[model samples]
Target: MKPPFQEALGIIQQLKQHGYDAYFVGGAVRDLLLGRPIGDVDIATSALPEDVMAIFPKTIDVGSKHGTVVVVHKGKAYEVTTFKTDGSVTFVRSLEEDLKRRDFTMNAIAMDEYGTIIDPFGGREAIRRRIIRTVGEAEKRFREDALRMMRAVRFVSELGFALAPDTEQAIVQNAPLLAHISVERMTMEMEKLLGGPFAARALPLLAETGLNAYLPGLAGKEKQLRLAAAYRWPWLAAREERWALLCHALGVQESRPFLRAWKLPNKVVDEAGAILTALADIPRPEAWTNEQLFSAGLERALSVETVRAAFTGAPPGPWHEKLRRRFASLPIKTKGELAVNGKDVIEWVGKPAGPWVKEALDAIWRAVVNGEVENEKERIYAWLMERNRTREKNC
Candidate 1:
């Protein structure tokens, strides 16, 4: 079974060859135990940074201050951190003692290079019981690193596990500590939590803990949020789709700036903005017209409809097929597809280079898109001429 991750295990075996202890560590171990797909393998090693470097020819000193190095196996990259202790000692024994310093018991686990488990914290048991309990004292753990509070909620969002009573109480009590954490870090956890299959479950905890305030622009709005959190669907395929659903629940009007404030990339921001715009204009997906389909591409229109289905619980109607037909039948999707350009408009209308060129082209683009007039240059010219005659006679 471990052979699938043979590359990662190779690093552990190399460390052991030189009398240094190492094992697969952290969330990868927990996920492995839960039968979930392994995401990343963190090798916890007794060897310090220098020792790891000597053991492997290909290594990077990512952050040697904490005794962490990036080791490239024959075909994979592995991050191996030395036994770390932020509390009472400079370096704890990287094997047993290092496992004691994790945020949640479910994550404070390790498996030997040969698949021997070294779970002294009952982490394996926690996984079996579907619980999220902190490694030691819940309050002390939160005080040590405020972001752990966010991780606890993220864990709930990811695994859909119930939090232990004490851990739940401690989180709400120490909710204010999140103020010390960075928005970027908070956003990282949030992106995972939001994309998790159980993401909707974490919403109430986030709101109750007052954790929603530290992030950008989610304050005093809990009424519709619960409804927003009701999305029980599996994880979204695309990243922006998740943010679009969340922002929609929060009544986001300007999603571009909203996503930017949340530290999303520009590309993600634009995509999320488009989803919000489409959803905003069409309350019911089936109500979309041919124009709306052209504005929001077919893929995104379907994405908006999917999100709408989650919110309204309405059985998906024939809107998808209907919208597909609209897009398919459209003669031109954008201005670039039009046969005439600004220069063509100026020459054909005998107008100088001025605002009228843009105006006439805009009219032509609209007509061609709506199938009002043929897109040929001569037909477009006649269409605009009749409009000019009509305007002159009215004046």
Candidate 2:
């Protein structure tokens, strides 16, 4: 067990010793049973928030009103949730109630401190059968929170399990509820789903359940996504290529606006856009140039190559090896290595901060990349003066 799990077990042991019922619960138990790596250790106890706070000095009431506290021990954080039932009549209940309301049968199971499995909803059998089944009254669960519909598909993708027919029906019935959920939450789940090995399956499910319309740039490309899913590739390439290929099938080149509609972070938007752009511009292996290597960087260039390999139905090894050799042969990979800095350009051009500084550096870098200019200081200085004079005349 990791230090975090051991610490969490120790806390549960202490709670039991103090006459409080506590057990390791939720995803930790599910993942451990599945022989998958667990991310966090959550403990559910019979102790109330006040009792938990009194017992532990290092407690943060992160969700105290909902009867949950976070206990930090030895630089590890564990979420200790107090057991309580829901207060209202809804498809979704309180924490414990919501656990019962969980979308998948596998995740609904809990466990005690002694590692005794708590199978309140036949999650063990579902896991054994490799199927996704919902808790009781699936329609109510979907209606309570529409995001559960996406969660069901995502869980199927992550676990590589078949979704039970009834569970699928529930999601289809409540597909419109996705609009009620926040885009940030939806984007987070979508990104995680895409990053998984089975993301292609999720895309088809999204289309079948009519939820694809809610995801920007996914509607009407179901067949393309399904075809991409049929190809065997590494998980990362499967994700980037599938999305890019889908966009190609849909006849759209720009994904920035789509990502913005999905509320994705700027970094994610930029990387996705760059990946698609590079994928579309697959260069012949023999025609690969230092300019392309320098502009794309090693990582992005390799990602582009990976996507290209997927598109051509070619094995990734040869292309990746060639890219490795090509990148290794590059003399300089960035503008900073062109024997000129912003300060040098400013002094040589006798100009203060302006667009010309950037223009001069870019020109020098490109010249160096294309082998038209040497990395020598004197050659670069003379070249920059001539380039700046030509630019002034044109202006």
Q: Model 1: runs farther than 4 Å from truth?
A: 232-235, 253-257, 315-318
For residues 1-395, write the lDDT of model 1, one tens digit per residue: 46545767778787888888888888888888987888888888888889888888998888888777999888678889889886734676646678778798888898876777888999999999989999999999999999998878888988889889999899878878887888788888888888777777787677776576766677766665566676644534567778887887878777877788778888888888888788878987668876667777788988787777666775445666777788888888777888887887677668679977777887787788878998787888788878888998999
lDDT of 2 by residue, 196-215 (tens): 66766776777788677776
TM-score of 1: 0.91
Local distance difference test values of all predictions, in order: 0.80, 0.72
Please provide TM-scores, in order, for all candidate models, with all chains considered together.
Answer: 0.91, 0.85
Question: In model 1, which range of ten residues has the least summed lDDT?
Answer: 228-237
Q: With candidate 1 superimposed using the best TM-score fit, by how many Å does residue 69's alpha carbon deviate from the native?
A: 2.1
Stretches of candidate 2 exceeding 4 Å from the true structure: 1-7, 86-99, 231-233, 237-251, 341-360, 382-395
Output the worst ten-in-a-row residue range by lDDT, candidate 2: 86-95
